Structure 1
Amino acid sequence: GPSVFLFPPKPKDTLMISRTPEVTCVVVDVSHEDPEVKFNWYVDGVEVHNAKTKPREEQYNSTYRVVSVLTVLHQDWLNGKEYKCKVSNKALPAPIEKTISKAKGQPREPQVYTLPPSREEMTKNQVSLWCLVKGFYPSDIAVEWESNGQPENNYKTTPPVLDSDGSFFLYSKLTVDKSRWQQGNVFSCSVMHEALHNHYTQKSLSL
């Protein structure tokens, strides 16, 4: 049968005013015979009409994937507005309804620490710069790396890991060539979370 998934906006998108946060309603396994999918979006129980339903994409297993995207206000998501997606199809007895809102719990401010490469790693042509981000609540977070204002294309962040105090922690790894580090090139770790002042903080790291 058809399955409905309701995804929240990207943590970065809700926190940065220059961005456009959006809620995503994904409908999977729609039969070729009856492909017509109707979306009804509700915001705090009131029907909204700003949704853009992306053209039905065909899957290898002869099924359809119909996606509806709804642009939201940063303040609306952050203040706790409930976003409801109603999905109607004839291969469904009753329309599927899915509801999402912001992650609950008392938010906690993450502490941001930059760790330089190990003295052992200096034998390798590429070194690792670390970003320890800990004590944050809830898990919704965005971590990035930049240099001279321009971003870095060789970084990977771990998923938030639950600490013994009930807060979360993560590590963002930046991979640079050893010479880059040895000049005194400055690398910044920018962290975006709802509990941080201005939803943003930047910590630097150089030799």
Structure 2
Amino acid sequence: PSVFLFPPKPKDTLMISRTPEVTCVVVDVNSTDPEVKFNWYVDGVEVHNAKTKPREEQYNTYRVVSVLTVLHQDWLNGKEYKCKVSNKALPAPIEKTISKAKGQPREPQVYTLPPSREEMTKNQVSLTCLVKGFYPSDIAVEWESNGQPENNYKTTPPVLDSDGSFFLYSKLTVDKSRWQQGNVFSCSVMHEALHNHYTQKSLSL
């Protein structure tokens, strides 16, 4: 018996449109009694609105999931979520808790950065978005142009900087021509320390 507790995605907690969930995975439950109940605890008080997914025999044992929709404000305010798993004839229930990382939240700085001169000898070129000074590391970055989402972009993991804040870069790739004929590209950042959790910074020739 091993129990794994997963947090919601940042984007899910930052946009009120989306639905943030905490999922409780239990695996390696002996096929003897694969009957298991879930007790969910939000900051002490128990809650009872957790969908519990139908058990599924893994090829090797059973694995089952309990899903709990969370309130955007609760998670961001730092309430602990507690997953108590109960199994008939199991010495004691297992308890796993989760909460958003603790620490002074801190607003990210977003600078857009055009390609180098030496890079203009290719047919693709690199538009850079630097995002730094933020805390916690949970963040979301996307490129777009003319309100259309962009594609050839990859974003580094957050890296821990020397002041305890985090930074990342995001690299967008567009053909020299798209950038050459003017054209405005745009780096989007989602983070709990921004106003309305969101910022645009743009970049053109």
TM-score if structure 2 supplies the norm length? 0.91
- Which deviates the most, 64-73 or 176-185? 176-185
Q: What is the CA-CA distance between 1:112 and the residue it aligns to?
A: 0.2
CA change 1:116–1:94 in 2 (3 A) is same
* 1:52 equivalenced with 2:51 (yes/no): yes
Question: Cα RMSD between the aligned structures?
Answer: 1.7
Q: Tell me how many residue pairs correspond in the alignment.
A: 205
Alpha-carbon separation, structure 2, partners of 1:180 and 1:37: 56
Distance 1:95 1:132, change over 3 A: same
Q: Which TM-score applies when normalising by structure 1?
A: 0.91
Query: Cα distance 1:150–1:3, how it changes in 2: closer, same or farther (>3 A)?
Result: same
Q: Deviations over 1:56-108 (max 9, x none)?
A: 344443x3331211111111111222211111224742111111122111111
Flag the 1:53–1:126 CA change in 2: closer, same or farther, 3 A: farther
Q: In structure 2, what is the Cα distance between the partners aligned to 1:112 and 1:120?
A: 24
What is the CA-CA distance between 1:27 and the residue it aligns to? 1.5
* Gaps in structure 2 of 5+ consecutive residues: none
User: 1:146 deviation in Å?
Assistant: 1.4
The 1:39–1:136 alpha-carbon spacing in structure 2 relative to 1, beyond 3 Å, is: same
CA distance in 1, matches of 2:204, 2:100: 36
Cα distance in 1, alignment partners of residues 167 and 201 from structure 2: 16
Counterpart position of 1:117: 115
Instruction: Identify if the C-alpha distance between structure 1 residues 47 and 175 changes in structure 2 by more than 3 Å, giving closer, same or farther.
Output: same
Identity of aligned residues (%): 98
SS of the equivalent of 1:55 reads coil
Structure 1 residues 64 and 148, CA gap change in structure 2 (3 angstroms): farther
